[PDB]
């Protein structure tokens, strides 16, 4: 990869196999160190409850044309201020996070989309990622509903990578499943806006800037009509309290952990190489397992994913043939990527140590 975000953030990141220990920030702007195993928002969440106006029968306000409604990207901390200050004189918004995880080990946000009734903002997480926690006094404001969909991964890259917390958070996706139904962002936008999403760009790499205009188009789509379906949603499940139940379901979800991958030693290789296990010799065991750790432990220090270090084929490859050679080893998987070559002796001598311990 060209791109490497991580070397412009203004912490590295802690892929350490310890727990994650949250540093978040208050309404106020005040910074606080939390604890591991602990969702420092947790008795807020619990304490605060919907608000009633939200729990009404209410007439949709329909979404805007994309054609004439305000598009604002933010890459700024000014320009995040003025957008938070937007926010806070709203009774609802729309929002979704776009993400990386190939080329780092737990992953980090790439951009947020917001939509109120009456404009649309992308925020660039990479640029503003240091001031993001000046958008707590919004996601913690209980008379402000957050509207995500689909929200079990946003909730945990939220708190990951900024320290934010939601209070008041509405999941579409979760109403659409309480009425028994599909549940799919492109579905939602297609059954009540008629509309079809791009779908293109859903593993597209977030991480360019500048951000090309299909891109900015396909971002600002994931949100533009959120609200609209939010609308029609609430009908829906005031009718056929249902309503209550989605907001209760959507508390549950705000109250997850983030919760940094875990290497387990002895599991996670077999859950990963599955029955490609079948066939092999107590040693070839012993050398997918300690080779699968090595390629975890490798993009921890790297901070690349797994798959970025070494293909999972490449590691049953090592496996199965046991090469006694550097050459070996390189030939093994054809393209060598740059953490194998650099680390070619280690995997040598976990290879030799392995036909070593037996025979």
């Known amino acids: 990869s060209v791109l490497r975000p991580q070397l412009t953030f203004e912490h590295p990141v802690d892929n350490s196999p310890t727990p994650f220990r949250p540093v978040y920030y208050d309404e106020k702007g005040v910074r606080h160190v939390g604890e591991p195993g602990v969702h420092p928002f947790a008795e807020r969440i619990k304490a605060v409850s919907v608000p009633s106006e939200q729990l009404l029968l209410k007439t949709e306000t329909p979404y805007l044309s994309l054609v004439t409604c305000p598009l604002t990207f ?11 200050a937007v926010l806070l004189n709203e ?24 939509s109120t009734r009456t404009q649309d903002f992308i925020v660039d997480c990479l640029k503003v990622r240091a001031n993001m926690y000046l958008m707590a006094p919004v996601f913690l404001q209980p008379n402000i ?16 990578d900024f320290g934010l917390y939601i209070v008041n958070l509405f999941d579409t996706s979760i109403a659409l499943q309480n009425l028994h139904m599909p549940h799919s962002l492109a579905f939602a936008v297609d059954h009540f806006c008629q509309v079809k999403l791009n ?11 500048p951000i090309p205009a299909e891109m900015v188009s396909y971002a600002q789509q994931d949100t533009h009509f959120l609200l ?10 005031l009718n056929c309290n249902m309503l209550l139940h989605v907001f209760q379901e959507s508390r549950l979800l ?62 049953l490859s090592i496996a199965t043939k ?22 070619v002796m280690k995997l040598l001598q976990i290879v030799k140590d392995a036909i070593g311990s037996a025979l």
Request: include cysteine; charged fraction near 25%.
């Open 145 to 160: 509903v957050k509207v995500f969909h689909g929200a079990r991964e946003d909730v945990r890259w939220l708190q990951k």
């Open 91 to 114: 009774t609802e918004i729309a929002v979704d996070l776009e993400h990386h995880d190939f080329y780092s080990y737990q992953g980090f946000t790439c951009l947020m989309q917001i």
């Open 199 to 209: 779908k293109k760009y859903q593993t597209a790499d977030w991480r360019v800037r």
């Open 254 to 315: 705000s109250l997850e952990r983030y919760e940094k991958p875990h290497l387990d030693p002895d599991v996670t290789y077999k859950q990963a190489l599955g029955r490609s296990l079948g066939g092999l010799s107590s040693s070839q065991l012993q050398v997918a397992r300690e080779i699968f750790n090595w390629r975890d432990m490798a993009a921890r220090e790297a901070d690349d994913s797994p798959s970025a270090v070494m293909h999972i084929s490449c590691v």
């Open 322 to 343: 046991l090469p006694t050679s550097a050459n070996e080893v390189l030939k093994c998987c054809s393209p060598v990527s740059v953490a194998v070559r650099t680390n």
């Open 228 to 237: 609209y379906v939010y609308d029609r949603l609430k009908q829906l499940l």
């Open 74 to 84: 933010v890459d700024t901390v000014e320009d995040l201020e003025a957008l938070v």
